Amino acid sequence: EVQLVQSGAEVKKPGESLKISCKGSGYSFTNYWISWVRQMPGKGLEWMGRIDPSDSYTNYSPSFQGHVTISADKSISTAYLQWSSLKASDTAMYYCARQLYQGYMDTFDSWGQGTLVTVSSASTKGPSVFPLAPCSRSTSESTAALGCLVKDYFPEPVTVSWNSGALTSGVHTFPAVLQSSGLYSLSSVVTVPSSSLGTKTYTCNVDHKPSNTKVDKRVHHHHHH
Amino acid sequence: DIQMTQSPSSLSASVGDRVTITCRASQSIGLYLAWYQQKPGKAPKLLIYAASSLQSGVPSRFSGSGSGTDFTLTISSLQPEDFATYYCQQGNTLSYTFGQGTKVEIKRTVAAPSVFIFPPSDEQLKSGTASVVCLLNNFYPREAKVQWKVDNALQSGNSQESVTEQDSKDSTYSLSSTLTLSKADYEKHKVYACEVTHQGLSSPVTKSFNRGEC
Ligand SMILES: [Zn+2]
Ligand SMILES: [Zn+2]
Ligand SMILES: [Zn+2]
Ligand SMILES: [Zn+2]
Ligand SMILES: [Zn+2]
Ligand SMILES: [Zn+2]
Ligand SMILES: [Zn+2]
Secondary structure, eight states: OOEEEEOOOEEEOTTOOEEEEEEEESSOGGGSOEEEEEEOTTOOOEEEEEEETTTTEEEEOTTTTTTOEEEEEGGGTEEEEEESSOOGGGOEEEEEEEEEEETTEEEEEEEOOOEEEEEOSOOOBOOEEEEEOOOTTTOOSSEEEEEEEEEEEBSSOOEEEEGGGTBOTTEEEOOOEEOTTSOEEEEEEEEEEGGGBTTBOOEEEEEEGGGTEEEEEEOOOOOOO | OOOEEEEOSEEEEOTTOOEEEEEEESSOOTTOEEEEEEOTTSOOEEEEETTTEEOTTSOTTEEEEEETTEEEEEESSOOGGGOEEEEEEEOSSSSOEEOOOEEEEEOOOOBOOEEEEEOOOHHHHHTTEEEEEEEEEEEBSSOOEEEEEETTEEOOSSEEEEEOOOOTTTOOEEEEEEEEEEHHHHHHOOEEEEEEEOTTOSSOEEEEEETTTO
């Protein structure tokens, strides 16, 4: 098969340089152009530039002209995208794609799996985990919600399970939000029968590979009022 | 600088529906338009090129029409695997440019959210911060308004929210909103409330607690 495989996820600080790669296989590398495309968090696709690997002739979007360098090492069927000095705003998914000229236009017929680039001045940090539980006299239905707030970690992602994976039904783990501190925060919740509160125990298990931490939190409202 | 404008930015449809998405270029591009599908976390996939030509391997329920400045992608009998985001791309001239995308979502009946409010924990407060969380569980459609009130004063600039993708079982959304205050600020107030407005509710619903009573 025609295949493009990109280098792995990157986490960098502003001002650092970076070079990411795209290796093509299952075709004549020099017969097809490669394009680079940017997709910022929650946004659409942006064409950055292209390169003809047969002679390294390049074209850049005016938006990207002067900010990135596209290159190719045709001897190893690899294309590259590089920055001399990263900025936080360069945080995005980057795709390489093969161009196939059909119907008299260039089309992006084969895509790499993407390379996630995160640029931030933040340093690696494990989360704090806090319970989410209702006030004592607030459970007003037969269904109650519980959860945990996973706060102040970097970088993404964390993984959350409930009762060691025994509990999966009704679980909602929300997208993380980036706080003004530069650290992320997310919540995970679960709905359970109001009757099981106190009779059954609910614990969230929070893994953060980047910091090599794991935090469990048994969830309840500790009442003093 | 050929600008591509897609509409709508999102739409809700049912399996079996004929879906149409439009793309308009700021100037003529002849037939040189392509269409791509993308699902969350995955790379785009080419569907159609030269306005009307089907990419090898793509189901024939996908079809394209148009020329000049007006184009449409049609999915004629929508399937479960087709819920995704779609992008047009002009290839008339450099630079290649994309439309901003159209998200095709799952239509279902209106469902009001169940609403819950959670006070901050004593462990968090010890560290000097108070997060108050409001959860809206299993609602449809997506459009919802969550307003925080503290001592009956509407809050602004001190909350963040996020929303799940549609549920794989009931096609609903859930939403979490977090209000963040310093401990000192949290402790000077009494009443904490989140007010929720949604199509499924005949009037806004408020969940609240009182410090010292919670
Ligand atoms: Zn510039
Ligand atoms: Zn306790
Ligand atoms: Zn209490
Ligand atoms: Zn106690
Ligand atoms: Zn739910
Ligand atoms: Zn007050
Ligand atoms: Zn107290």
